[PDB]
Structures are given as C-alpha cells and as structure tokens.
C-alpha cells in the first residue's frame, strides 16, 4: 500500500485509457497510445500527462455510454504500486521502476522518459523484468 495507483478508462466507440503512477501526493498520469504486449523490449508508448487530482481517479469525465452511447472516462483499476527503484527520483530524473497491485491491474512495469533515443519527454512503458 504505498504510492497510489490508479488507471482510467476512456470508454467510447473506441477504447482508449491513461496509466497514471501517483507519487508522493501527486498523482503523475501517462496517455495512449498504450496496450498488451510481450516486453520488456516493446515499451508502451506513456505520453507524460497532466497531474490529476487526489481521489479523484473515481470519476474523469466524459459521457455515460449507458444512454445511448458516447464513451465514459472513469476508474477501471485502483490500488497501489511498489518501487523497484527510487519511485520518486526516477519520475524525475527519467528511470521508473515500479510494480502495481490494484483492482485489476497489476505486476511489475518501468518508465522511461523518452529524451533519449525518442521523442522528448514521453515515456516509456515496458515490463519490468530485469530479473
């Protein structure tokens, strides 16, 4: 049970989402283009989104598709994430190493800051197994 995890789900006609690390009481976020794969070797594109709000991984935003269709944004897993590295520091200084125990997602994953042979500031979300 330490630093909190939550992913949301943006539901719609097509299915997107935002993995997002909180840490130490800020709770970073990180977009799709993201899915299943093999790893690590094939990091999942985290795009190193806004801070979100405490708590509030309840409920983003959007439209309840249960009308008639449109797409809701809401929690789909939560719970909480181990450091494998410095949890804090790696946020920062570009090596994320951490593992997710939440409602349905879980395991051990790393990010990654994509300034370095990428993009600029994206990051890079790969399985964790270094052992």
């Given at each position: 049970?330490?630093?909190?995890?939550?992913?949301?789900?943006?539901?719609?006609?097509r299915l997107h989402y935002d993995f997002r690390l909180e840490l130490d009481g800020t709770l970073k976020s990180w977009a799709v283009p993201?899915?299943?794969?093999?790893?690590?070797?094939?990091?999942?594109?985290?795009?190193?989104?806004?801070?979100?709000?405490?708590?509030?991984?309840?409920?983003?935003g959007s439209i309840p598709q249960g009308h008639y269709g449109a797409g809701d944004?809401?929690?789909?897993?939560?719970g909480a994430w181990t450091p494998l590295d410095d949890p804090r520091e790696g946020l920062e200084k570009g090596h994320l190493s951490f593992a997710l125990d939440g409602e349905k997602l879980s395991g051990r994953w790393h990010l990654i800051r994509?300034?370095?042979?990428?993009?600029?500031?994206?990051?890079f979300l790969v399985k964790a197994k270094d052992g």
């Amino acid at each position: 049970g330490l630093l909190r995890y939550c992913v949301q789900k943006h539901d719609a006609s097509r299915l997107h989402y935002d993995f997002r690390l909180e840490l130490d009481g800020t709770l970073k976020s990180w977009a799709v283009p993201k899915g299943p794969c093999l790893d690590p070797a094939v990091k999942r594109l985290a795009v190193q989104v806004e801070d979100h709000p405490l708590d509030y991984a309840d409920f983003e935003g959007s439209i309840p598709q249960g009308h008639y269709g449109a797409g809701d944004v809401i929690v789909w897993d939560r719970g909480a994430w181990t450091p494998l590295d410095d949890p804090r520091e790696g946020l920062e200084k570009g090596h994320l190493s951490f593992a997710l125990d939440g409602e349905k997602l879980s395991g051990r994953w790393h990010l990654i800051r994509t300034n370095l042979r990428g993009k600029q500031s994206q990051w890079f979300l790969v399985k964790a197994k270094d052992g």
